[PDB]
Ligand binder design. Structure first.
Ligand SMILES: O=C(O)[C@H]1O[C@@H](O)[C@H](O)[C@@H](O)[C@@H]1O
Ligand SMILES: [Mg+2]
Length: 301
């Protein structure tokens, strides 16, 4: 059948392109039985809404950010932990290894099959002034995703967090409802947030993954061969995504800079001040010995 899949991003964005690529591959692996259509631009709803729809089987699939599972799948909190990953190479090795697998496995009890992660770079604060330390965060109305952890992260940085859906952030910034948010460079560019919040400060406070989830209610009706085809197509989409994403990080940085944005390099941001402030949250959100073990497996990579 045609599986319906949700994404907040536009059609040309790397996540949408990767799932469309998966769909093309899936078609061939199933003798034309299956394909995927990606409804971008938050057409099917916010991330929160589309996750609830995937869980009841109203839509087949969604490519969403890991933060959107933080109140549903406890293990999803872990890779949103602040300053957990040293760098992108660390994220890749740990998240496409056994530790990442344990996180994927936890989705199944919550009515989702987590097929793969996709990298999402590092999230950084942007605003109408640069931010080198927490003092600089004070008084900023900072949009966050609707995640208790993300609320706590921004509060710990010194800002005042306000949860909002991704599609609404641009209007929020343009009209002063909020005056800052945080994200990777491709998202900063795609949404035009860089036009109204031109100071992008590389706090690199989180390296939250994307997750591609499939509705378990729909999954449970498929044969093992069909399931295996879907899993292979998802796995095969990752190097395709990585080529697009690495190129997009670079082109986004150049595009926003040419479009007037000022990037404060990570080296000039008081990483020390932010690590001080944010570090206790790990212990707050380790709600089981299994979560502690996953964190340890990531750190040991
Ligand atoms: O901040 C957000 O809501 C967005 O952040 C982006 O990095 C993720 O790609 C997107 O899935 C999230 O919806
Ligand atoms: Mg430990």
């Amino acid at each position: 059948r045609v599986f319906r899949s949700a994404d907040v991003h536009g059609d040309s964005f790397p996540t949408n392109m990767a799932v469309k690529f998966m769909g093309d591959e899936l078609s061939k692996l199933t003798g034309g039985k299956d394909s995927i259509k990606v409804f971008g631009n938050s057409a099917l709803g916010s991330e929160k809404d589309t996750v609830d729809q995937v869980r009841i089987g109203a839509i087949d699939m969604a490519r969403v950010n890991g933060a959107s599972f933080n109140e549903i799948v406890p293990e999803s909190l872990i890779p949103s932990f602040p300053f957990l990953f040293r760098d992108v190479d660390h994220f890749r090795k740990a998240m496409y290894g056994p530790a990442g697998q344990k996180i994927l496995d936890a989705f199944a009890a919550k009515g989702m099959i987590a097929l793969t992660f996709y990298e999402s770079g590092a999230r950084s604060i942007y605003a109408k002034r640069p931010v080198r330390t927490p003092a600089d965060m004070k008084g900023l109305k900072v949009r966050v995703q609707p995640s208790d952890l993300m609320v706590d992260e921004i509060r710990a940085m010194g800002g005042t967090p306000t949860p909002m859906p991704f599609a609404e952030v641009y209007t929020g910034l343009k009209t002063g409802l909020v005056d800052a948010a945080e994200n990777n460079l491709p998202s900063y560019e795609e949404t035009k947030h860089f036009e109204v919040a031109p100071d992008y400060s590389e706090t690199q406070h989180a390296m939250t993954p994307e997750v591609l989830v499939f509705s378990k209610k729909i999954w449970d009706t498929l044969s093992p061969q069909e399931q295996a085809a879907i899993r292979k197509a998802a796995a095969d989409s990752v190097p395709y995504y990585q080529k697009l994403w690495t190129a997009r990080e670079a082109s986004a940085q150049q595009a926003v800079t040419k479009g007037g944005a000022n990037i404060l390099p990570a080296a000039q941001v008081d990483r020390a001040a932010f690590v001080k402030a944010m570090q206790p949250l790990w212990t707050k959100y380790e709600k089981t010995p299994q979560m502690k073990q996953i964190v340890d497996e990531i750190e040991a990579t």
